[PDB]
Symmetry: C3
Subunit: 258 residues, 3 copies
Amino acid sequence: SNIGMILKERQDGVLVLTLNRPEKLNAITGELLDALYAALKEGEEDREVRALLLTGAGRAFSAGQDLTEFGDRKPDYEAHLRRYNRVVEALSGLEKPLVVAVNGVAAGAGMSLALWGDLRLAAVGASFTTAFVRIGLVPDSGLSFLLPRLVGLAKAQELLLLSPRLSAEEALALGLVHRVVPAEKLMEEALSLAKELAQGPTRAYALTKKLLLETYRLSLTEALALEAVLQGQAGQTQDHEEGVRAFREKRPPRFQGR
Amino acid sequence: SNIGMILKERQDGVLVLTLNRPEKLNAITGELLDALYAALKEGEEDREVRALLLTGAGRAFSAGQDLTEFGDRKPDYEAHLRRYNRVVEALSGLEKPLVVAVNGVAAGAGMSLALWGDLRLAAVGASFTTAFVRIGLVPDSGLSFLLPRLVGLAKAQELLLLSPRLSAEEALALGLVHRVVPAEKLMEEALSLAKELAQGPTRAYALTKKLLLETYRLSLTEALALEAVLQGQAGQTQDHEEGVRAFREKRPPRFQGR
Amino acid sequence: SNIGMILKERQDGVLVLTLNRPEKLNAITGELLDALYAALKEGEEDREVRALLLTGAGRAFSAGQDLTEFGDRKPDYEAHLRRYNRVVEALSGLEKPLVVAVNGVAAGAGMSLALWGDLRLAAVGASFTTAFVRIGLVPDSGLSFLLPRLVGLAKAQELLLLSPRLSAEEALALGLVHRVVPAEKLMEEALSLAKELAQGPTRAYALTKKLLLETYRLSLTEALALEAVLQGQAGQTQDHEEGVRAFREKRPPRFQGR
């Protein structure tokens, strides 16, 4: 066990975060979410970290909200989500790339959290279930935002209203993940990809993520203006100067994340 | 025939609505749309109804607008659509799940209407054609909203600008429908699914539909806030209390739609 | 060579535009963009033009921005994009249909430009690479707007963050293009399609493009209102009157683009 249930380890330029309540299928609590927030913040502030990798301990990625967090009192989910929505905000705006390695079941808010990865891998055997509807709830933790963007509205309707269990291979066909790998190889493959990202142009990744997060709500005119502003920022980086020299020399760039 | 051209029948918890102008391929008129509005309203108000099913009589689902509704006068489609857009608003915001059973051709506004189903089935032999461009018109009745969300922008461009006729099997591959079934089994299968939905958590369905309708225009911050508000509502339902007990007991929930 | 690097030729009702810096893979410069703007404007103003076709000379469609346009000075990409974003605005709002024929590599802003076609064809052998990230930049020239709409967010993340090279066949599977044809047949097929569009209801195409450009940022209510306004305009065209007569007579319509 560990206090706060988020294991942390640095491998090169990668901060590896592991959801660690395996006896409860990494069920989500406010305590866990505070620890996840703190770990994301530490990774973003750490100049030795250029990428993050998120996975689960044990057989699950996460089964979603721990229903025992709430008393027998009529629940106040508006207040709970207003308090803990900052964690989704933190994932959404992370200024470093995030790889997610889905090692087992991802259900409810566990599915929400997994889908915040920029690049997502699943083990053979892993699964995704929206789950909320089976207990009379709506999608939360950003799932109503992410799912239609990732899989389109037609599949989002079916997945949310009927809550089927999806295999890793079905997840891959829909865009819930980018790659499926055998369970014994998932962490090796996810870490290799995270290490490659940790050598990449971290600022260009950060700014690209911002453009993607906003794309659907902007007019074309607004999107062009935002592209201009963020490209202005990316153009002033040391990494852009390096990138131009490496292309002229037809060699690999040596990026530093600034 | 029936006055207003919308047949209504209740089977258990399902209101079955049938477009009924088969001699004109269920062509849409203002009269028909007023009758459809009234039937949707009655179904939403009826405490014995937990789901709706929409289909067509005869060989078509609907061939779209009846061009004979308009005189030889220069038409005023802005005024016509401003008057009848309330029917699309009613479909979009329905606080009960809607199944559509596409029994034959769905063209123009008939395609628009079919695509408002939450879950959509087509018969083998049915077809979808955007059609508007073939008479020099633009998509209406919400088709410009729904089509890019359901099939993505690339397919929406082709479907709208070239107006190909799509088979049921092509519709399934694009996400225009969720299932294809033999013509003789379509109503049995669509009714079975509607009856399953009529046993489900109707409030969670209603509130999920609201999140989906708004998802693309919201910022992540706004989407999180709306998730919090609607989850607060879903959390106060009798069905959520039931859903938690049924999960703890690992048995099927017995939902009532409140 | 030609001054401004945009070849122009009219074939029937089609203005054919060819990017013409083949020795530099049709690399984009401000000079080229001014010439492209001017050619789009001339085609839109020309009453003998009902469709446009855009392609590249030589082995590339376009390799994107010419990095030699900028001095050794710290670049100001915000000012550069604010100046040249009008060209993307011009493509986005074109009141005639645009076919793109991707004859070879489309990278960076060359990929951006190709994806503004309403209908897009690629040669066998052509390729698409987002490219910006390889020099530490973000997507520009509307690519952050178009790519998630065309391929969905999951594929847009991978394509932008990892910048794989996509084959024509991969592009087709994602929706980056609508058709793949042998290199020796690309211009014949693209011209045939452009000529068909040049016989179509040009106003309905123009107004449909406007609805598509706005669809994701509008509420359903706003989208319905915009459908009403634009359908009102389309309904007053000579082509709509023709379209109704041709459907009643079950013969091909003879559209004029007004």
